[PDB]
DNA sequence: CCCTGGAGAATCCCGGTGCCGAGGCCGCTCAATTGGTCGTAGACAGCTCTAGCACCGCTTAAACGCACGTACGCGCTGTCCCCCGCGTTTTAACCGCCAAGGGGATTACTCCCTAGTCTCCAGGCACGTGTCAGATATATACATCCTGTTCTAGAGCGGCCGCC
DNA sequence: GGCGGCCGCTCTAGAACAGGATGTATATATCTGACACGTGCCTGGAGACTAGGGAGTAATCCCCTTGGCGGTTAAAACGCGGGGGACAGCGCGTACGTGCGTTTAAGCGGTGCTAGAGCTGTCTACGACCAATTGAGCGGCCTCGGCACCGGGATTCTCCAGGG
């Protein structure tokens, strides 16, 4: 007997392929919705958000983070690496102007 | 005129030491010789030593 | 988008097809560079050094 | 509502990076990505708050979210 | 013996000098004739005002200076102090240009 | 007018990077910097060409370059 | 700009002072982030690892 | 240590259900369509005159090129600890169902203030000019950086002493 | 009498410190050239007025998001095994920093010409607005079929073990 024991990286590449061609929202609805309410409650209390309003916020935030992750990933190969770093994000936001 | 004229051991003196800053020049009149530029600046300073 | 729908043998145009059509065309990519498309994802590409 | 910044779970951030073609994800990425998402959400929602307050409305609509994203060069199609 | 400044000392001195002085780094006519040959592909009978070339030159340099700042930060991000063409290509890709 | 891309000389590109805080400059940077300068100029000047053509003028003014840079989010002060 | 002019021992506002005033202040820097200023240069800052 | 055969598991092609969102149809009604009518922005023609284009001296700081070496990009190694793949057990995510009650959307009355003029006048703009801060200039003076010489600590060697 | 151990001596090298070098920080001298003050208008905002129309407010309504329940099974989280990569470190070398010789064109100043942008009339079709109208877009309803779902099967690519 012997376990399959996939090496690190190969299943991650498979998850890349299975999710780049996918369409469904990766972030769960209620955890993202609850995060919106607590952020808005610091600006204005007793505030409501429509279901399509949270849906519009969710896709825009995912695409912005995905595009940030592509810049984060492309900086890794630029830095002769395959693992992203917290400093990799900070460089990406600075170059983007954020 | 020329490319090597100095009273001491020359360092390719113009008439100015080339390869050096402008605040190193002296235009005094003394006995100047060439001697094939002190036999190739003292045979490359005894071969760098 | 119809060509992309024919690539994955689909009759109905879905928002993934619209996103694939926009990003594949270099004229549409620059025109809609600052444009977010909902339910579209991104281009399924892998870096050369990231391949096994 | 407290500690809702942890709602964006570690596999959720992992799945988002998989869509971006990221090979490996460090353990400190998730905390940084949550902070980046918090900063980005704190700008879009605040802009949508002023859009909603300008309309004498108490609920933020999806159309105001589109205007909040459009004014920063991040326009969203399909609402 | 010559003073023989180490590599980096004079480069740092140019960094201090050009970051407080607002003199125009690229020369006027070599940049001016580049505008004429670029605009010749769009309009053969075209003229440019003196302030028109002036407006183009400061905008181009500030874009290049900002690009060089992003290029330099990518070098330290990649454990380097020398800017590279691949660092420039990463800067345009992150900024969304190329 | 040919070979005017070499008008942006090597010390001129060197002075640009020194203003940007660059310590060391590669030898292949100047050719790449000339390319991104040509691409940037081929967009702004062409935009100013359409501005000048629409204005019924045969000379490009600095005012037309102002809107050409502004429409790409690169607005210039002092004209 | 006047504070930056006093730091440079100048009693006349010059475009370098205006650029220094805009970029130093954080809300002005983000507001005019996509804004080019002529005859202003940039902030005289050097990275830590670039120092001798 | 590298090449090749067989089998475990996630993925791809395929048959059957169906269902719920998409395709097609009916009014019909409100926004698109037709004709006329003017104030008026705009195309066209002539003047001009102020700024750009082309060439010329010159001189001088900017730029190409070659010699040299040392900070640094890059190739290679280990490791270990940092991150992935998988088994297990919670967990809250998504879905099915229910009211609620603030709240978005619509309609109407009405009331303020903004559209549109008349007249004018006092702040704003073009012109002219004395002037006061910035730049050029240069000996003087910082000012830090590079390098040479000397100080002191560390490791290696050799001589001397005690023990078997 | 031989040898291990201990202490002193000289060699060597890292590092703090002082001196020389060259590019800038300032102290006047003087030019100088736009800066701001004064003036003369003069052209657009303001007081006043007329009229009307779009939103503030009130009411309704129905509708849609929040709270609030569980079921369930997908998935987050914890932990174990382990495995491949980030990084500290080292070595090579080359290629880019530094420096001046030499060249070459940047730029200042000058002169001449005309390409053409404002400027002023002129006259002319053109679009907002007003009656008058009318026909397919859209809300809604009927129908229907493309792919989500559920499995079934399979090529098919991939990893582990055996052989040279």
DSSP calls for F2-22: -S-GGGS-HHHHHHHHHHTT-
**DSSP secondary-structure letter at B9?**
S
Read off the tokens for G9: 């021992």
Minimal Cα distance from D72: which residue of C? C34
Task: Give the closest nucleotide to B22 (alpha carbon vs C1').
Answer: I100
Q: Can you give the CATH number for the domain in which A45 is found?
A: 1.10.20.10
Interface of A to E at Cβ within 8 Å reads 71, 74-75, 78-80, 87-88, 91-92, 94-97
CA angle A86–E8–E14, rounded 5-degree value: 95
Instruction: Please answer yes or no on whether D21 and C35 come within 8 Å at the CB atom.
Output: no
**DSSP secondary-structure letter at B13?**
B
Cα atoms found within 13 Å of the Cα of residue D55, Cβ hemisphere only: 14
| Pairing label, strands C35-37, E82-83 | unpaired
Read off the tokens for A56: 């519009």
C14 CB-near residues (< 8 Å, 6+ apart): A23, C5, C39
Instruction: Please answer yes or no on whether D20 and C46 come within 8 Å at the CB atom.
Output: no
Cα(A22)–Cα(A49) distance, integer angstroms = 27
Cα(E79)–Cα(A78) distance, integer angstroms = 10
F67 touches chain E (CB under 8 A): no
Contact list in C for residue D79 (CB cut-off 8 A) is: 38
Do residues A51 and C24 touch, judged by C-beta distance below 8 A?
no
- From the list C50, C32, D47, D74, the residue with the least C-alpha distance to A62 is D74
Q: Is the CB of A91 under 7 A from strand I?
A: no
Cα(F27)–Cα(F11) distance, integer angstroms = 12
Task: Give the closest nucleotide to D58 (alpha carbon vs C1').
Answer: H103
Report CA(B21)–C1'(H139) in Å, whole number. 20
Nucleotides on chain I that have an atom closer than 7 A to a protein CB are 20-25, 36, 56, 64-66, 75-77, 81-87, 95-101, 105-107, 115-118, 146-148, 158-161
Q: Is the CB of A6 under 7 A from strand H?
A: yes
Closest CB to C41 among A20, A64, A82: A20
Cα(E2)–Cα(D76) distance, integer angstroms = 63
Number of domains in chain A: 1
Count of other CB atoms within 10 angstroms of residue D8: 21
Nucleotides on chain H that have an atom closer than 7 A to a protein CB are 8-12, 22-23, 51-53, 62-64, 69-74, 82-87, 92-95, 102-105, 133-135, 145-148
The continuous run of DSSP H or E covering D46 comes out as helix D29-54
Cα(E26)–Cα(F14) distance, integer angstroms = 10
Cα(F49)–Cα(G13) distance, integer angstroms = 34
Instruction: Please answer yes or no on whether G34 and F73 come within 8 Å at the CB atom.
Output: yes
Q: How remote is the C-alpha of F38 from its chain's centroid?
A: 7
Do residues D38 and D50 touch, judged by C-beta distance below 8 A?
no
**Which residue of D16, D17, D20, D21 to mutate against C (max C Cβ within 10 Å)?**
D21
- Calculate the alpha carbon distances from G35 to A17, A97, G30 in Å: 40, 12, 10
All partners of chain F with 3 or more CB pairs under 8 angstroms:
E, G
- From the list D16, D42, D10, the residue with the least C-alpha distance to D28 is D10
Closest CB to F21 among G15, G39, G45: G45
**DSSP secondary-structure letter at C32?**
T
Cα(E30)–Cα(E45) distance, integer angstroms = 20
| Pairing label, strands A48-49, D59-60 | parallel
Total residue length of chain G: 52
Cα atoms found within 13 Å of the Cα of residue A34, Cβ hemisphere only: 12
Q: How remote is the C-alpha of E74 from its chain's centroid?
A: 16
CA angle E72–E74–E79, rounded 5-degree value: 100
Q: By what method was this entry solved?
A: cryo-EM
Where do breaks (C to N over 2.5 Å) occur in chain C, by preceding residue number? none
Cα(C46)–Cα(B31) distance, integer angstroms = 77
Do residues A18 and D14 touch, judged by C-beta distance below 8 A?
no
D22 touches chain A (CB under 8 A): yes
Q: Is the CB of D20 under 7 A from strand I?
A: no
Cα atoms found within 13 Å of the Cα of residue F76, Cβ hemisphere only: 27
Minimal Cα distance from C34: which residue of A? A64
Cα(E60)–Cα(E53) distance, integer angstroms = 10
Backbone CA torsion sign across F77, G2, G4, G7: positive
Cα(A57)–Cα(D66) distance, integer angstroms = 9
Cα(F63)–Cα(F48) distance, integer angstroms = 9
CA dihedral B22, B24, B29, B34 (to 10 degrees): -90
C22 CB-near residues (< 8 Å, 6+ apart): C28, C29, C32, C35, C37
- From the list D41, A5, D51, E39, the residue with the least C-alpha distance to F42 is E39
- From the list E15, A31, A72, the residue with the least C-alpha distance to F22 is E15
Cα(C8)–Cα(C6) distance, integer angstroms = 5
- From the list A68, A70, A73, the residue with the least C-alpha distance to A93 is A68
Do residues A41 and A47 touch, judged by C-beta distance below 8 A?
yes
| Pairing label, strands D75-77, C35-37 | parallel
Cα(F37)–Cα(E56) distance, integer angstroms = 11
**DSSP secondary-structure letter at E5?**
-
Cα(F5)–Cα(E38) distance, integer angstroms = 10
F74 touches chain G (CB under 8 A): yes
Cα(D70)–Cα(E1) distance, integer angstroms = 64
- From the list F75, D4, A66, A5, the residue with the least C-alpha distance to G34 is F75
Report CA(C17)–C1'(H30) in Å, whole number. 35
Cα(A97)–Cα(E97) distance, integer angstroms = 13
Read out DSSP for E56-88? HHHHHHHHHHHHHHHHHHHHHHTT-SEE-HHHH
Read off the tokens for D67: 């205007």
Do residues A74 and E93 touch, judged by C-beta distance below 8 A?
yes
- From the list D45, C42, D18, E95, the residue with the least C-alpha distance to A58 is D45
Residue ranges of domains in chain D, CATH in brackets: 1-79 (1.10.20.10)
Do residues E34 and F7 touch, judged by C-beta distance below 8 A?
yes
Cα(E82)–Cα(F29) distance, integer angstroms = 10
Range of the domain at E64: 1-98
């Amino acid at each position: 007997k012997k376990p399959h024991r996939y090496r690190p990286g190969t299943v991650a590449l498979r998850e890349i392929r299975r999710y780049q061609k996918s369409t469904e929202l990766l972030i769960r609805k209620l955890p993202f919705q609850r995060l919106v309410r607590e952020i808005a409650q610091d600006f204005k209390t007793d505030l409501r958000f429509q279901s399509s309003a949270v849906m519009a916020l969710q896709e825009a935030s995912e695409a912005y983070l995905v595009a940030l992750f592509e810049d984060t990933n492309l900086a890794a190969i630029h830095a002769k690496r395959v693992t992203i770093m917290p400093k990799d994000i900070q460089l990406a936001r600075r170059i983007r102007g954020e | 005129g020329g490319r090597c004229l100095a009273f001491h051991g020359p360092l390719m003196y113009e008439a100015h030491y080339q390869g050096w800053k402008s605040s190193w020049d002296e235009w005094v009149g003394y006995d100047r010789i060439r001697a094939y530029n002190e036999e190739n600046i003292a045979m490359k300073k005894r071969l760098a030593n | 988008a119809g060509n992309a729908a024919r690539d994955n043998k689909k009759t109905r145009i879905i928002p993934r097809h619209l996103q694939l059509a926009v990003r594949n065309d270099e004229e549409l990519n620059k025109l809609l560079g600052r444009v977010t498309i909902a339910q579209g994802g991104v281009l399924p590409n892998i870096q050369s050094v990231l391949l096994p | 509502l407290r500690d809702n910044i942890q709602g964006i779970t570690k596999p959720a951030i992992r799945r988002l990076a998989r869509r971006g073609g990221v090979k490996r994800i460090s353990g400190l990425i998730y905390e940084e990505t949550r902070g980046v998402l918090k900063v980005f959400l704190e700008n879009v929602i605040r802009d949508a708050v002023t859009y909603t307050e300008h309309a004498k409305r108490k609920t933020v609509t999806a159309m105001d979210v589109v205007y909040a994203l459009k004014r920063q060069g991040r326009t969203l199609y399909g609402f």
